[PDB]
Scaffold this motif. Structure first.
Motif, PDB file in Angstrom:
ATOM      1  N   UNK A  30       9.297   4.192  -2.112  1.00 14.61           N
ATOM      2  CA  UNK A  30       8.784   5.012  -3.396  1.00 14.61           C
ATOM      3  C   UNK A  30       9.818   4.979  -4.625  1.00 14.61           C
ATOM      4  N   UNK A  31       9.815   3.904  -5.432  1.00 13.17           N
ATOM      5  CA  UNK A  31      11.015   3.827  -6.240  1.00 13.17           C
ATOM      6  C   UNK A  31      10.602   2.924  -7.370  1.00 13.17           C
ATOM      7  N   UNK A  32      11.413   1.861  -7.742  1.00 12.88           N
ATOM      8  CA  UNK A  32      10.707   0.978  -8.575  1.00 12.88           C
ATOM      9  C   UNK A  32      11.536   0.892  -9.981  1.00 12.88           C
ATOM     10  N   UNK A 112      15.457   9.272  -8.337  1.00 11.85           N
ATOM     11  CA  UNK A 112      15.694   8.047  -9.607  1.00 11.85           C
ATOM     12  C   UNK A 112      17.063   8.187 -10.457  1.00 11.85           C
TER      13      UNK A 112
ATOM     14  N   UNK B   1       6.268   4.120 -12.814  1.00  5.57           N
ATOM     15  CA  UNK B   1       6.563   3.662 -11.353  1.00  5.57           C
ATOM     16  C   UNK B   1       6.627   4.805 -10.461  1.00  5.57           C
ATOM     17  N   UNK B   2       7.017   4.232  -9.340  1.00  6.38           N
ATOM     18  CA  UNK B   2       6.742   5.266  -7.899  1.00  6.38           C
ATOM     19  C   UNK B   2       7.773   6.604  -7.903  1.00  6.38           C
ATOM     20  N   UNK B   3       8.863   6.172  -8.445  1.00  8.51           N
ATOM     21  CA  UNK B   3       9.805   7.635  -8.840  1.00  8.51           C
ATOM     22  C   UNK B   3       9.178   8.477  -9.775  1.00  8.51           C
ATOM     23  N   UNK B   5       5.505   8.535 -10.453  1.00  9.11           N
ATOM     24  CA  UNK B   5       4.668   9.076  -9.528  1.00  9.11           C
ATOM     25  C   UNK B   5       4.915   9.962  -8.572  1.00  9.11           C
ATOM     26  N   UNK B   7       7.444  12.158  -8.851  1.00 14.66           N
ATOM     27  CA  UNK B   7       7.739  13.443  -9.467  1.00 14.66           C
ATOM     28  C   UNK B   7       6.649  13.964  -9.657  1.00 14.66           C
ATOM     29  N   UNK B  61       6.363  -0.754 -10.697  1.00 10.94           N
ATOM     30  CA  UNK B  61       7.570  -0.771 -11.523  1.00 10.94           C
ATOM     31  C   UNK B  61       7.685  -0.681 -13.044  1.00 10.94           C
TER      32      UNK B  61
END
Lengths: 122, 122
Positions: A30-32, A112, B1-3, B5, B7, B61
């Motif tokens: 869960x990053x990116x 993040x 990005x997924x960070x 999403x 949040x 991303x």
């Protein structure tokens, strides 16, 4: 799909290994964003780029064909984008396995804030 | 990005994605097959199909622009793709929040032994 990618991971590294990649580094799970932190992380970055190169379809939902042969992941007879997607996962699972000796627990669950660099380019 | 999403999800559901939705169901987690198990799970499948509609940028991303305003999530971008990803994430976080009341821990790691039936179709 991720159900298959998860079995490719589990089949190569061991039972339950997929859950180690849920959130690790700036890219795995869960990053990116930002700079990959390590080889494991870069595995994930490459896979994100590999998925981003897939046109006309949706890798999260794609079901492809694969198996293990002598311990090793083999993509089956996949046509069109399925071949590309199976290969993205194959490469990434193999990448995780080959870098399991630099896997560092302290990179799980980064917020993040640790990833505020301009994101590496595919 | 997924960070981002992630949040949106914490803000709207009270839950840290990496410990909850990320391992949940047949769609929220490492899934992409079988039946959506419940409302939370369905929200995720909707979000997969949403991502499916995104062609010119990588939804995993692409770093978009958003803020929270009075409980709402506001997507601020111009680049149509950035905005389209943001709106995917927004709707799903809003949907997750609407169904946290039936979050069921028993769907955590459900994809290890389930999700083997007819899959959902977009």
């Amino acid at each position: 799909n991720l159900f298959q990618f998860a079995r490719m991971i589990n089949g190569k590294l061991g039972a339950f290994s997929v859950w180690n990649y849920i959130s690790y580094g700036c890219y795995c799970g869960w990053g990116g964003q930002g700079t990959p932190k390590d080889a494991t992380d870069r595995c994930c970055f490459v896979h994100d780029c590999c998925y981003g190169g897939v046109k006309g379809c949706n890798p999260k939902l794609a079901i492809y064909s694969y198996s293990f042969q002598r311990g090793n992941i083999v993509c089956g007879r996949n046509n069109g984008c399925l071949r590309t997607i199976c290969e993205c996962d194959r490469v990434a699972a193999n990448c995780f396995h080959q870098n399991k000796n630099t896997y560092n627990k302290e990179y799980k669950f980064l917020s993040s804030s640790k990833c505020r660099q301009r994101s590496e380019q595919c | 990005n997924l960070f981002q999403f992630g949040e949106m999800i914490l803000q709207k559901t009270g839950k840290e994605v990496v410990h909850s939705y990320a391992i949940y169901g047949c769609y929220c987690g490492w899934g992409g097959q079988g039946r959506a198990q419940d409302a939370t799970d369905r929200c995720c499948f909707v979000h997969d199909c949403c991502y499916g509609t995104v062609n010119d940028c990588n939804p995993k991303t692409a770093t978009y622009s958003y803020s929270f305003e009075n409980g709402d999530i506001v997507c601020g971008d111009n680049d149509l793709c950035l905005r389209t990803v943001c709106e995917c994430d927004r709707a799903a976080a809003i949907c997750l929040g609407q169904n946290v009341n039936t979050y069921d821990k028993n769907y955590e790691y459900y994809s290890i032994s389930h999700c083997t039936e007819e899959s959902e179709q977009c």
